[PDB]
Amino acid sequence: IKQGIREVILCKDQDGKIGLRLKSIDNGIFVQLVQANSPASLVGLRFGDQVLQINGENCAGWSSDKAHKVLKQAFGEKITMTIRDRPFERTITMHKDSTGHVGFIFKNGKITSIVKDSSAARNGLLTEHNICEINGQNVIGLKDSQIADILSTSGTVVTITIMPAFIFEHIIKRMAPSIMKSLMDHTIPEV
């Protein structure tokens, strides 16, 4: 969750696709979905990122529809965007015990209880927050089973990006949990 604003520059794939869906939230535009192996993924747009400008037009007070309209009309060659990194999220760093636990319980991606004397307790992990990333890897839409797996097979130091449920629920509204599981970039970042 960086020091604020960054410029990214995009190029539509052969199909005229950048690989992005946008949702209007509190008179901002925010990233709803980033398609695996898309232009948007390569330049490194992420779930929950904010779009301030699109080719130097201010996005504030645009509808989800209009954001999408805008993206089409644009000359494919080069699209500049001004991004604010994942404003509604935070990153917590835990360390597993020798039982391999950070020390919390979740359900449908959402944390539901914290476990006395754990690292998640020591570090102030909060309930009623949905899990967004784990060790830099988007996990939104996976089954609770798989999210578990990634925490088993991570090292000692775990890093979890979280988002207030109320805000999370209001972003993923109008996107089926098939497209979530199918098409949302869940890959480790390319270098």
Side-chain angles (χ1 to χ4, degrees), residues 93-94 103 168:
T93 293
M94 272 142 287
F168 181 78

Side-chain angles (χ1 to χ4, degrees), residues 65-116:
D65 297 325
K66 196 201 164 162
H68 294 158
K69 274 152 86 80
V70 161
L71 290 171
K72 298 177 108 159
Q73 297 169 122
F75 308 146
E77 169 66 349
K78 151 173 155 173
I79 302 178
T80 61
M81 271 176 162
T82 307
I83 301 300
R84 184 190 288 287
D85 177 34
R86 292 175 288 171
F88 295 126
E89 279 149 280
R90 284 192 298 130
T91 296
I92 319 298
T93 293
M94 272 142 287
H95 306 237
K96 294 150 93 161
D97 46 342
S98 61
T99 321
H101 286 101
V102 284
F104 74 84
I105 300 185
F106 73 101
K107 186 193 161 189
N108 298 96
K110 191 181 90 176
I111 306 170
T112 52
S113 63
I114 312 292
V115 164
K116 186 180 177 193

Side-chain angles (χ1 to χ4, degrees), residues 62-179:
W62 289 355
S63 64
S64 326
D65 297 325
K66 196 201 164 162
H68 294 158
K69 274 152 86 80
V70 161
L71 290 171
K72 298 177 108 159
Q73 297 169 122
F75 308 146
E77 169 66 349
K78 151 173 155 173
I79 302 178
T80 61
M81 271 176 162
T82 307
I83 301 300
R84 184 190 288 287
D85 177 34
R86 292 175 288 171
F88 295 126
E89 279 149 280
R90 284 192 298 130
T91 296
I92 319 298
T93 293
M94 272 142 287
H95 306 237
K96 294 150 93 161
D97 46 342
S98 61
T99 321
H101 286 101
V102 284
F104 74 84
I105 300 185
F106 73 101
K107 186 193 161 189
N108 298 96
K110 191 181 90 176
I111 306 170
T112 52
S113 63
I114 312 292
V115 164
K116 186 180 177 193
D117 284 359
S118 79
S119 182
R122 282 198 301 292
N123 278 279
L125 189 60
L126 297 182
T127 69
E128 201 67 9
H129 285 75
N130 266 259
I131 301 167
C132 281
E133 300 174 8
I134 297 169
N135 297 292
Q137 170 176 344
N138 174 316
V139 311
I140 291 172
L142 306 197
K143 293 168 186 165
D144 280 345
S145 342
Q146 306 175 258
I147 301 171
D149 278 309
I150 306 172
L151 291 170
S152 317
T153 50
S154 191
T156 57
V157 181
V158 189
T159 276
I160 308 187
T161 304
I162 60 177
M163 174 172 317
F166 188 67
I167 302 167
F168 181 78
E169 278 311 312
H170 173 219
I171 292 177
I172 66 174
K173 173 202 64 175
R174 302 309 199 238
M175 180 225 328
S178 323
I179 316 160

